[PDB]
């Protein structure tokens, strides 16, 4: 059952550099389940992503998905790409979207209809929401703007003039809405956290003059491997998912809730660096729910440190654990 060329997993490996500049062989294995077709897609139809994908300019637009070769994650990320879709296609002015993963995640966000700014003697507020059937809910609709928490959002500006060129944010946690005091309103969404969000790039450490002169080429001393997690913090699981957990999403389909139960198969990888055979358990690093396509992607990963014997890598095989 030791399969280099696996019959249902798509498997890909990339070398990465760790925070000391040392090479790491990262093996990622991926499965996709069609919620519509109720079947696993064949490995040929499964793509493991070498690079992040952005909606617009990289670094200035919502991140659709991150790359899949993190050297380490301490828990499973769960991320959603989809739209708010009102029940039965009845127009509404606001609705709730909920991500439920038993034991790990229970998250509701409130989605508002589109709104306009209302100016009044140098004071600005928001109009009533417009009715909608479906809408986008990515971080360009979250609080942000002139704000390192989310520089692609709206509602945070240094002047009324700038504020009026921004989109009124529409995605919030329950009991929160836009207020002029921006830091009291959380950035909200279900999608992956772009590295240019302060909550993430802060974890990469301080690239200051001290670093430039005395630490480089190493990463900064305050680099934190949590930087590799791409889910929102309340969508990071309690450790790694083990199989059998139930996932439920409501508000992303007009007609029904999405429901998915994780497979129980677990995997072990083996990498051959010459005469040295190495074994590491894969863990589930990412659960990516695309409700527009009706697919759930599952990416498993393991990382083999190989600064000693880079060129000596012969083979990598993955076998299911019985």
Author numbering: 4 to 325
What does the article say, verbatim?
To circumvent this obstacle, we next screened a panel of DUF2169 proteins encoded by other Vibrio spp. that are closely related to V. parahaemolyticus and found that the DUF2169 protein from Vibrio xiamenensis, which shares 64% pairwise sequence identity with DUF2169 from V. parahaemolyticus, readily crystallized and we were able to solve its X-ray crystal structure to a resolution of 1.85 Å. The resulting electron density was of excellent quality, and we were able to model the majority of the 337 amino acid protein except for its three N-terminal and 12 C-terminal residues. The overall structure of V. xiamenensis DUF2169 reveals that its secondary structure is almost entirely comprised of β-strands arranged in three antiparallel β-sheets that form the core of the protein. These three β-sheets fold into two β-sandwiches that arise from the two shorter β-sheets stacking against the same face of the third, more elongated β-sheet. A search for structurally similar proteins in the Protein Data Bank using the DALI webserver indicates that the structure of DUF2169 is unique and therefore is considered a novel protein fold. Our structure also reveals that in its crystalline form, DUF2169 adopts a domain-swapped homodimeric arrangement with the swapped region (residues 195–232) consisting of a protruding loop that contains a short α-helix contributed by each protomer. The interface between the protomers is predominantly hydrophobic with several aromatic residues forming π-stacking interactions. In particular, Phe210 and Trp214 from one protomer π-stack with the equivalent residues from the other protomer. Collectively, these biophysical data support the conclusion that the domain-swapped dimer observed in our crystal structure is an artifact of crystal packing and that the protruding loop that facilitates this artifactual dimerization is highly dynamic and extends away from the core of the protein when it exists in its monomeric state in solution.
